[PDB]
């Protein structure tokens, strides 16, 4: 019965990733004064299926891998870490209810850079390795502000428990006391997933075949939908009736769809950063504000007499 | 003595003898040294959790912080060596023979 | 040279993490709080040379609380004799050791 | 026009509705028609194991009330 | 060394409070008010004797006074209490704040009849 | 078998240290140390030290082995390997991992149960959940008392990290 | 290096050693060694040549391995004692590992194989710090754990230190390697008397630090790193010709100079404990140190004099080097034997 | 808003903790009888197992003191089945 | 002090916001009338069992029941 | 146990999708291709600045590891000490960032 719950988590993840490609091509279409796919299915509903079958029968690129083991383990680690970020998510009830679910997600997202590093070393190209090292340095730079923003908001949560973060927001959305942390969190999640204006890899894993590239692509989109669900739960916490949980489920699903469409709408609106410009954007802009607001959210519940409970 | 602690100490001694038997690279030496640190973390953690000794819960975090700062220092030394010579080979580090 | 600056200045820098029987958060005792307290109150102030032979019983009790070597040895003896009496056949387990009796509370 | 993005968003939203409805209904089916007992701390676990002992059927969720004592 | 001295299984028999954790938590504050004195005698005996073998009769008095507490609930206010611990029992974290009207009815019937 | 999961993860931990300690290359050594850190973190997590295991994943594997792999990729110049069609490039990988997990099974032989069944660890091994703690983790409150009780420890640790920043910026400048 | 950064880093070296000295908790001991190593690494790389980077790498590896073995000793002590007081240890395994770790930190033999190389690679001031200030923390820990130290182990490491620090100084012309082998021999002398009377350990440590600092201060004042370059000093600064060499007659241990005081008090306190063979053989190996260092004294204030012409240009410039405490250290390292019963202040 | 609601959550926390405190003497008495029941069952099975072995004393304390020592997991659940040992020693750690 | 502040709020408003927020976080809890209530709420949160005292005969402040008038009060917490 | 079962399920699904995405196009007998980069073949140039940003990450990540028990540290009875040490840790992280600034360390990847 628990395996039914695990599969009804992980297979709709893959279906939502499949149709996020359609939603992205349609929303980028209408914002660019054109249409997205509307010929393949009825208004494009068969486009992800046709794309998946095309990518899984395309000829392999036939690489001379610098390592067999890392060439195979980079998509496996990318997909496994893409799928394990969903199991503590309280929507309204998590699949795995754990006391340190926030810290679990932060640790499993810190592990996600090895797919980039192993994919870049497992190619023979030096330019692919250089692009992978730059992608890894970008991702580890923005994980810093992820961790400090997340700690600062959990100073209002009270614990690392994800399910408590719904209780925290029963009177107000937590974006109202923490909108600068919300906006720096949002741009930092935009820079975690190599997403425009922070996708310099499209300006590292181009040694893989079309199948494994589809696997990295779907791990990336599972990460994108997941971080939008996590940002929804973290700042825009929905109403939870404990007798009708589907109210919370409809509510956070609408909010997470809007936030994923906001990712789609930011990549259709802005030019990319130069590499040092987003390194500047992290280290000299977001990080001083993040440290100052971390001091502020340490000292504020003490001066307002509003320390949240541990339990 | 105790059972799982023998395994963690044996892992420590295997990584010690890996550090005490250089093959080619300085990075492999730093890897064996930080495997020694990992086994020290695991062993200190299992003792402190087993004893229900509360205030030493912060001890392995401090072990991890100080020795990862140590490892950052080792990586910077390795980088200065590799910028001197081109490779991080331990046989390039033998000018202090005379 | 042990320059006892902490006792000279009357500050506490690291005495609080030193023993298990010290003041702990939320008054949590260690597993061997009483055994370490008895060993410390035995061996206090008499010096280590007298403490190794005059407080040997409290220290053996406290080490056997910490590591449980005599207890694990006794449990292995009882369980291995139980395995021998099952395989020979002169013993059968009771219902409260097979999970058949719907426990006390 | 713009509302042709809505079938894909509808499919993606139904696919994100499935896991939460699934875990809520499975938690109610596996725990006596109620929420799953959360045990983050050892007191909640001690009470949950005490429930499993006092239920008589080796299931923590089967509750016993004033009908059980004399 | 010496033989550790354990009480017999007849020294350990007492009638058990065979109710669930939500049933205990629903009557918890009234149990602390009404069954105060043998509970506090037992916990003073428990932190002073430092031994569960020297506290057995005070623990039996605790179990007896708890059983008399729940009999006195059962004779008077059975249905508001059942309505209250059912609603406490639905919750995962067993919240008090989700069940204020059943708490109000239970407290009303308990203050009236007892 | 399922009782002995901490002992099994320790055997995997020792085998992974034998794996990278024989040092085939620093990159495969880093991979073996990542796997060993994960299984030793599993050893920590199967006593109930959940914050300390998540500190392993977030800090050890999450920052330090990342910087080790990142530095190792900027040295030890890569060269290709065998890349023959999918029996050789993936079937040999599957058979190699099958031999490795069969080795993990094969080291648990009758010479091992002579150490196991004579000194039976399970039955009384993880005594962490012996009685009640309360509405907290003891491990979490002991880590949390770094700020109320561990003042000197915070001062010397933060000063050593500031000095670590200064020291790295001195020795890497090369001037 | 920025002098503010130099002052902050030298205070961090001193702070790490003070933290090892004053703390009662083993984790703070380990922290003090970590802080001391981390802070002393840029002092070695102050000039940024390949020799200093190689020396800093070898020093890092040896001190890091010793720190890991120290923490393993601490962890075994927590197994067998359940506590953290810096006092005696409660397992011979922890005692053995901590004695090995502190012997690696001191560069006592057979863990001596880094001290001449690292002392060669780094400048003279950082070599002075490494051979004087870095000895203080592990000798403090050896002072505090001496109810636990195995006698045969510490005596073996002491005699192997004195023999290898003796036979290392034959083939040497580099002054820093000579001071490093002198270090190995003197640390063997200090740990020989540790389990009998550690006040004589502290006496030998203080007199050795005074004589070592006199020698490194004179080597900095003359800008000499080899024997061959030290032998040009008579034509340049003639008062330096006698001070270096009668300080070096002190360092081997030779009366009436103050470097005879530690070895004589060590022989004196080891024959109270009915050990007659051992101070005799250790001081015969100290005479082997005298053999080589007397040959160096001959080479500098005797035979191999010859000069160069550009000394005629160095004659027109006096020294501007701050020879700090050099007359004080030179008077303390030579004329302190009549004040030998001052050693009770270290009790 | 977070000021008002975190003060309310601290009051609700104190209400839950007072519920626990009111329940603790009952649970402590039941836990005492529980562990004494289990040690007496293990003592009787030690007496009916350790007969052929000479020089054995049933219920011999491994300590030199007569102070009550808190029983280990294998003193209580030692002679029991592996499912009870799993639910006793990895139950809370593995619970979801 | 007012020309420099406008100059740095013209050049670098990110760092001006950072130093201002951090300065408020430093010097503001020393000035707040609610900082004492954080201490009073944290020391009134009962994680442990309130172990009772043996009544010797002269303790007029230690109550005999929770509903006795003497003892520490949390009416300030319900009112605020 | 439920965690490890879910991890094993996710790993098995990932390895199954990788195995299908490697083996399904290899059933094609497409062609045996003959003779299967910006730089020609030269060595990988080391960049000092990428290493400096990795070490700056590692040091601020250790400082973050110190910062992580703060939501539990707020619950203490010694609140003045806790607040002082929390502000001191974030201030030392800021002093590390300021020193990293004012020595041209954050340059050309700022
Ligand atoms: C207690 C332990 C004390 C340990 C010694 C502390 C001082 C030395 C270490 C630090 C250091 O280098 O300081 C600079 C150092 C000079 O170093 P230098 O390079 O050797 O001096 C060369 C010329 O003398 C430079 O001359 P100048 O042209 O620059 O100007 C004259 C200068 C300028 O004078 C001043 O600046 C002094 C006025 C300001 C003082 C501070 C005010 C604030 O005066 C002197 O230097 C005269 C000699 C001073 C005495 C040096 C030795 C002190 C005694 C050491 C202990 C000996 C123990 C023997 C035990 C034997 C038995 C076991 O000392 C001073 O400048 C003042 C020393 C004051 C000593 C006080 C003694 C009692 C303390 C209680
Ligand atoms: C989570 C839900 C959504 C949240 C909102 C986010 C959605 C909207 C996204 C819009 C599109 C963004 C696309 C990517 C853009 C990336 C570029 C960018 O924005 O760079 C950030 C820019 C970078 O600055 P810059 O590069 O423009 O400026 C130049 C900087 N120098 C001079 C150094 C070269 O700004 C920031 O970093 C600011 C972040 C937010 C700070 C919020 C401060 C709040 C106010 C504090 C108090 C102020 C008063 C002082 C104290 C008074 C006390 C009494
Ligand atoms: C010949 C010169 C070298 C030997 C010097 C011995 C000095 C001395 O006091 O010897 C008496 C000591 C007497 O020692 P002791 O007096 O402690 O003897 C043991 C105690 N009683 C008296 C009860 C038996 O002789 C020795 O120790 C003999 C060995 C000398 C050292 C080894 C010499 C090796 C070659 C150089
Ligand atoms: C998750 C996404 C959806 C799932 C994945 C896709 C779903 C559909 C899976 C089956 C698709 C058909 C088989 C793979 C495509 C074969 C195309 C091709 O080139 O065929 C010619 C190839 C080769 O035919 P050929 O002999 O003419 O070769 C042409 C090339 N020369 C002449 C140069 C040698 O056919 C095959 O390899 C046959 C393989 C088996 C056919 C399918 C059996 C049933 C499978 C179910
Ligand atoms: C620079 C350091 C500035 C802050 C110093 C510590 C501030 C503080 O609140 O300390 C109280 C704390 C604790 O005092 P306390 O008042 O919390 O003590 C109450 C007792 N306990 C902890 C059991 C609840 O620390 C100390 O008093 C001793 C440690 C710090 C001593 C000073 C070190 C200075 C190093 C400078 C280099
Ligand atoms: C959580 C929700 C998840 C939803 C996932 C799916 C999203 C898409 C939803 C449906 C979209 C439209 C489906 C129909 C597509 C068009 C099919 C079609 O018209 O095919 C016609 C073609 C030729 O027919 P012919 O006989 O030549 O006609 C000549 C007429 N004189 O004949 C053929 O091609 C042969 C018949 C093909 C039929 C294909 C039908 C669609 C298959 C979809 C697979 C997934 C279904 C959902 C699974 C999850 C829910 C159960
Ligand atoms: C090349 C190899 C293959 C690579 C791909 C696959 C592996 C990498 C991707 C997956 C990584 C998995 C990490 C799993 C552990 C995460 C931390 C964790 O266990 O957190 C959950 C929870 C802590 O929460 P808490 O509520 O405090 O505990 C329950 C008590 N109420 O704790 C619990 O609930 C404890 C449950 C029991 C302990 C389980 C520990 C994990 C299993 C052992 C390690 C497995 C992974 C080994 C490899 C790692 C990567 C190298
Ligand atoms: C039980 C005992 C407990 C502890 C008691 C006290 C122990 C004291 C141990 C002393 C250790 C000395 C370590 C070395 C000195 C430290 C300061 C330093 O770094 O001095 C060197 C410094 C470097 O300057 P720099 O710019 O590098 O110059 C090179 C040319 N450009 O400047 C120079 O190079 C200038 C040249 C002169 C340097 C002279 C340094 C002498 C220091 C030692 C004095 C004698 C020891 C104190 C008395 C005895 C104590 C036991
Ligand atoms: C006391 C509370 C705690 C304070 C410390 C913690 C603060 C939290 C944030 C941490 C920030 C860490 C990094 C700070 C580095 C400061 C130095 C600096 O950045 O100097 C360079 C900068 C000019 O920028 P530039 O070099 O040109 O950069 C290229 C882009 N233009 O020059 C500048 O931008 C000048 C920066 C300094 C002046 C800022 C003044 C703000 C004053 C606000 C009101 C007072 C607030 C109270 C605090 C006292 C402030 C003095």
Coordinates of C-alpha atoms in Angstrom, one line a residue, chain I:
Chain I
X1 CA 27.8 62.6 7.4
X2 CA 24.8 63.6 5.3
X3 CA 26.7 64.2 2.1
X4 CA 28.5 60.9 2.4
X5 CA 25.2 59.1 3.2
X6 CA 23.5 60.5 0.1
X7 CA 26.6 59.7 -1.9
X8 CA 26.7 56.1 -0.8
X9 CA 22.9 55.7 -1.2
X10 CA 23.4 57.0 -4.7
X11 CA 26.4 54.7 -5.5
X12 CA 25.8 51.5 -3.5
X13 CA 22.2 51.2 -2.2
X14 CA 22.5 47.4 -1.7
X15 CA 25.3 47.8 0.9
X16 CA 23.5 50.7 2.5
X17 CA 20.4 48.6 3.0
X18 CA 22.7 45.8 4.3
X19 CA 24.5 47.9 6.9
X20 CA 21.3 49.6 7.9
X21 CA 19.4 46.3 8.5
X22 CA 22.4 44.8 10.3
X23 CA 22.7 47.9 12.5
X24 CA 19.1 47.7 13.4
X25 CA 19.4 44.0 14.2
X26 CA 22.3 44.7 16.5
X27 CA 21.2 47.8 18.4
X28 CA 17.4 47.2 18.4
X29 CA 16.8 44.2 20.8
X30 CA 18.6 46.2 23.5
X31 CA 15.9 48.9 23.1
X32 CA 12.8 46.7 22.9
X33 CA 10.2 46.4 25.7
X34 CA 9.4 42.8 24.6
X35 CA 12.9 41.3 24.9
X36 CA 12.2 40.3 28.5
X37 CA 9.1 38.5 27.4
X38 CA 11.1 36.2 25.1
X39 CA 13.1 35.1 28.2
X40 CA 10.0 34.7 30.3
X41 CA 8.2 32.6 27.7
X42 CA 11.3 30.4 27.1
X43 CA 11.7 29.8 30.8
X44 CA 8.0 29.0 31.2
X45 CA 7.9 26.3 28.6
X46 CA 7.8 23.0 30.6
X47 CA 10.0 20.5 28.8
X48 CA 10.6 18.5 32.0
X49 CA 8.4 17.1 34.7
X50 CA 8.0 19.6 37.6
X51 CA 9.4 17.2 40.2
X52 CA 7.6 18.0 43.5
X53 CA 9.3 18.7 46.9
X54 CA 9.1 16.9 50.1
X55 CA 6.9 19.0 52.4
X56 CA 9.1 19.6 55.5
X57 CA 6.5 21.9 57.1
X58 CA 7.7 25.4 56.3
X59 CA 7.3 26.2 52.6
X60 CA 4.5 28.8 52.3
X61 CA 5.3 29.7 48.7
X62 CA 5.4 26.2 47.2
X63 CA 1.8 25.2 46.5
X64 CA 0.2 21.8 47.3
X65 CA -1.9 21.7 44.1
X66 CA -1.7 23.5 40.7
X67 CA -5.0 25.3 41.5
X68 CA -3.6 26.8 44.7
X69 CA -3.0 30.5 44.6
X70 CA 0.7 30.5 45.3
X71 CA 3.2 29.6 42.7
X72 CA 4.4 31.2 39.4
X73 CA 1.8 32.8 37.3
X74 CA 1.2 32.9 33.5
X75 CA -1.6 35.3 33.5
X76 CA 0.7 37.8 31.8
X77 CA 1.0 35.3 28.9
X78 CA -2.7 34.8 28.5
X79 CA -3.3 38.6 28.7
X80 CA -0.2 40.3 27.1

